[PDB]
Write a protein that binds this ligand. Sequence first.
Ligand code: MG
Ligand code: MG
Ligand code: MG
Ligand code: MG
Ligand code: MG
Ligand code: MG
Ligand code: MG
Ligand code: MG
Lengths: 386, 386, 386, 386
Amino acid sequence: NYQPTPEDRFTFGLWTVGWQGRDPFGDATRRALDPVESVRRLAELGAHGVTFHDDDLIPFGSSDSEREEHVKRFRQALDDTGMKVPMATTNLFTHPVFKDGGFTANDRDVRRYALRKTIRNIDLAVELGAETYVAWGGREGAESGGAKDVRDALDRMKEAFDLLGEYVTSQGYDIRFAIEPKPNEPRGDILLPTVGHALAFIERLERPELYGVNPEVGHEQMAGLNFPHGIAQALWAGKLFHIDLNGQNGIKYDQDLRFGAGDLRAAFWLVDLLESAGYSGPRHFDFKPPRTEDFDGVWASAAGCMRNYLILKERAAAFRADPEVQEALRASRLDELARPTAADGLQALLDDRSAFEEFDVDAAAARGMAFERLDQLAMDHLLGAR
Amino acid sequence: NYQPTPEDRFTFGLWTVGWQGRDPFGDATRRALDPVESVRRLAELGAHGVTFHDDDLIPFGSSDSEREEHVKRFRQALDDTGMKVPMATTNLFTHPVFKDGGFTANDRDVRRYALRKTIRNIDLAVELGAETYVAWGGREGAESGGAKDVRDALDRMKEAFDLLGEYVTSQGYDIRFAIEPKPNEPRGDILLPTVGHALAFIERLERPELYGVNPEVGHEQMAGLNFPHGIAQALWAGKLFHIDLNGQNGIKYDQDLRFGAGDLRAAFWLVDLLESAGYSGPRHFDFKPPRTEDFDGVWASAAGCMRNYLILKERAAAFRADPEVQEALRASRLDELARPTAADGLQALLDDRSAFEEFDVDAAAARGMAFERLDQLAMDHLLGAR
Amino acid sequence: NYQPTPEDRFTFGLWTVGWQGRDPFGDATRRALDPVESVRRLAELGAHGVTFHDDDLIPFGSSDSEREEHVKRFRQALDDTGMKVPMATTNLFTHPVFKDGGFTANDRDVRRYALRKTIRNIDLAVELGAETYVAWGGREGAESGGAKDVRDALDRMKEAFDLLGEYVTSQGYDIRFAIEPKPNEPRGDILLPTVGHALAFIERLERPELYGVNPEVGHEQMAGLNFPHGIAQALWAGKLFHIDLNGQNGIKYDQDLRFGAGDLRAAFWLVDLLESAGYSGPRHFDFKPPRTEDFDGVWASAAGCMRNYLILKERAAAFRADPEVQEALRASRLDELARPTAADGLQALLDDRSAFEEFDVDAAAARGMAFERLDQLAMDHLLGAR
Amino acid sequence: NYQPTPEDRFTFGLWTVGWQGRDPFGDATRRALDPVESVRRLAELGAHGVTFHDDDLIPFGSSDSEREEHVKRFRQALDDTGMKVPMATTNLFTHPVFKDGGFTANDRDVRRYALRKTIRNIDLAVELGAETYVAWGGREGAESGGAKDVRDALDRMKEAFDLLGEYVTSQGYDIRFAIEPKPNEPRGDILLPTVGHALAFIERLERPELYGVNPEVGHEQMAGLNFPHGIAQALWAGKLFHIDLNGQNGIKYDQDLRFGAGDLRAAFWLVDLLESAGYSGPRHFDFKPPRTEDFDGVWASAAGCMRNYLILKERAAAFRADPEVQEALRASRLDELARPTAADGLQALLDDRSAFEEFDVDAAAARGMAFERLDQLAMDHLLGAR
Ligand SMILES: [Mg+2]
Ligand SMILES: [Mg+2]
Ligand SMILES: [Mg+2]
Ligand SMILES: [Mg+2]
Ligand SMILES: [Mg+2]
Ligand SMILES: [Mg+2]
Ligand SMILES: [Mg+2]
Ligand SMILES: [Mg+2]
């Protein structure tokens, strides 16, 4: 009954179910989880794999001998369970040294340290089989206007990503990069604040084919943007390498609710789009079980992420298969939207008197779009009323 | 006393001072202005020029003989005053035929009509000397998820802009295009909702060098974004072709307040950036005198736009010239941000033990950034307390 | 099949289905509806009744003879259909004379005119059988700080409502007033911007028992507030006299989508609360069929409002009746929330060593709240997955 | 030069300058401050006094002997410096036991513990001379709809505040309560989310004269509301007992910037209102020096709070004293707003044919309000351009 299997490609960060509940105003409400026990419990729930920051897996400051022991234990749990590691990332935000950023810190020696910390984890990610390496520049930004010259900061950001691309190509690694945007928090404003800004920045890198985006549901909604629309533009550009699924109730702090919570209808249209477009990457959940919960509530919340995806997948598929919906899509001229405006070319358009001189503007204006009937059919399908 | 001259390149849309005050809940409070009298009054205030939609200058449905008479009267007022016309645009949003968009309307015949209406005004813009042609896709979007397949819509949007680029290059016109983003209103969500989304889309056009952005202060702030940061990314990409200046109080309907109203400190950092970066284009005001005002209040509001720019220009210049500010910029390491992270290259970085193995992470973390002293110096300069 | 009947008490404003589609950027897309034909069509759909502004029913400036004819035609349509008129209101926002407000306009003669226009429609409302008279102060507010002394404005607002209460009590009318809050639009900020501000203001009126609130879904969500929470506080205070149902996608212009659109889960919790608390007033829809629609889409949208309420009513009732949900409510201690904290009194609490000196704070902190399992049960019920 | 003195009544929470910089994504960047050294440094800066949570001053779990020692050291620093303690409050949010709230936790034993923890600190506050006791219900709320029955929660909230009022009156204490609203964070939605909701709730308490509000600049702006307008309604109701001053850049996480940062023009209108209305309470700063700063930046940020208040005070006073501004206020009819609408009474209004039958609605509509000239005079004064 809406039961996930590893074939559904559901993945979770170690930092999600492992979040101890420490927020800006309160201490942790849960003990720390051993990464090995997280891998085991997620495998029992039907997950496909896990993801990690370097500092989730190897405590900061560990010696190279303790580091090998932490990786050894982790790799044994992966072999014991069949879990994969499709993505990894770097923590360039927790340690106080990163208080003004990593790649765009004003201090040059911090920027060089940030790059070396990243490169070391790229080696580990490749060793564990990760295909995508995510960068979330959570500290790249400012609280005040004079603290950061943004043109210089973008130069430094481009320099850092170009160097990472030079590193992976010189090593022969088969891994790609995905930039994860966020508009604000913990900085007052964060550089590359939306999917669009990240897509535009990638086109100025030396090797743009190596970079895509890792959009997160809640982050685009923190700017009041339509997340399915932003995902469509990422897919249109061929840049949706990875995705972070969760829930968010509007414009406020980053809630990281379980997927399906927050904006339910946006979750429906998101799943409809991902499945229609044939997205084949991981369905990754970047969420936080609320700090009200004990460990039983943690695993219930994680199970809820996958359950809600599978319910929405079923409802979206029934919606698209419904002959009455297919009729309504034609009534609203979705078929005409897919046809070229002027495949006959510019000169034919200019000579076409039916396109302007003899166009009946009042008759075209009187045509209703029938969008409300279509949207109520979508509502009926979502609610199981049809 | 903070008096503008045409050398300041202040420009106004005919639709700004000519706004009659009709909002979603109320009738017009002011009579219509003759475009000729708007040109005269703006010239008296010290403006450099005006901009127009086709339908601002030539009433919709006019015959080709009435059309020549409207252009004739307008051109005579420009000659009488010395006013320029640096930018023009198309109205693809007022007439009911555009209720589902122009370039991305679901109906193909509307899309072809939208292109023909645009091409006709491009010819007129070139005749009047405009160097930039703006596109604001105010109706390109949706209120519901199934009404618009966004990948198909982006195909149609790219097709339309590619055809416009083919037209201007085949005619030999010396004009460039600027896309004006807006996140919402009048559609529930608008395609290309921010500067970033517009910049990313331009890189997929056939002739990207012909297209840039026309960002508007209030529109990026309707998504809660930092407008100076977005302008910096546009300048970094070489794409700031034009700009719309106004004011907005946060995330709500598009207010189009006079420039300097709304977020005053963002206006200060904006002017600082435009002047430091040597932006040489028009300082265009897309604002609406509130409908509480009579015609005396209209011209007072327009004068206020230019006055506030010139006051902020003076304060920003004093800020940057202050030796104590220059000292504080070095104390916050703005100078180090401008220097390459690794001009020595990747291999040198990997072999540099001071960048990781021997990096003193606690000593670097203890360095304060001194951002608050710098920001209070900026506040003191803005308020004239220094 | 989810078919409304007049017993469901669904009502619609004449201005809702009659909205012609004129928005800040576009002309009307639909012809005007005769109020008589709106009454007939809504009755066919299963509505209980209609509501009106004075100017919806009697065009502004009508003579007293044309006024009687408009009322006569309307009353005949009500008799022909069985439709009721449970609520009426005044248009104090469309005419330019109200550009700075009605009750709080700076000009005293406008304030007196606003009161006389209101009193005249109260007489008509009582004649048609209305039990609630709504006030939406859409023009009471400001775009700038010095334009309105808010303490003086609140004095004038209290003066106006006190005079209306003196009028209805001296006439012996059995009608009550409901204030409808909105945070902004069309003014930059509107006085009494939320349910809370309106509730607080009512307690300073001379006869507070005559006044309550008419909250609107989308308006509280324009401030990012939780609409079900605000309704609960209104019910707690005994002040929910009326309600406006619609949909809104977050913090932006007032969309007035059909009910069920926008925040679907908030609509579910709203219906759960209204039905559990025994709200017996009208279920009024203040919505706008999008201007993309023709008249067939108008009535489809109106039918969708009622359909979605009835589906959500069914899902909320199944949720509350589910024994497993009742078990989960006890697991989350909703039962303990309903019990007094200290029915034993202050002195008993102070002497109770188990409340502080001997309270085991670590054992209580370790109790999980089980909120996520409860919320997934609510999701399963909403989606019909259970 | 804009130098504060204790006569300016500037106060700071111990938790403000003492914030160690630990945010949801990062560790502390500053060592803990001894409360004694904070008192000394603030006195040197010109502060009037300090405020505290119980747990700021006495570490949680301290024995009654360590508790007396912490109070002794604190009282000696107050005597050494002349600093006052005008306000105190309870920490009912940091410890995990409060994860579902204090006064409205679902668990009854937690609610009783929360009351006992509060009462103990009220005794201490009275001993230190505090006149106001603040309650910020940061954990009172929910992330999901079924977790909290809000009517039951408001019953529990009223019960708790009624018991506190019974306690202070039975002890003969001369102290009043102030509720501090916040719309969200750390809970998904917080009960009593705005000034208005708090004002309305106070009117249902048994002894309403004992309770007022402690509004915070940034918190009302997290709902996109106009903070000066909300303060005016609090003053109108006679309920502004205390105020929290800081800065916030729009709708996002609670930034707690130094006062004057964020919305500068709202800070100007706030100071204008507080000084015009004769607010005599403490000017309290609830702010966080950004975690980018070292201890030198902490004290620079604190000094900036007071400096910006004094600059804005000077500019607001010059604005109101300017004869040209006084002329413009009369031109905009601010004088008429202060005069009663109908001091002649209801019957005189009904018989006044100039108020309706013979009112010239077109002549009144044509009057411009002259708000834009007034607002540019306010801008000129704020910027020192006049
Ligand atoms: Mg997030
Ligand atoms: Mg993420
Ligand atoms: Mg605008
Ligand atoms: Mg514009
Ligand atoms: Mg509305
Ligand atoms: Mg309404
Ligand atoms: Mg705060
Ligand atoms: Mg506070």
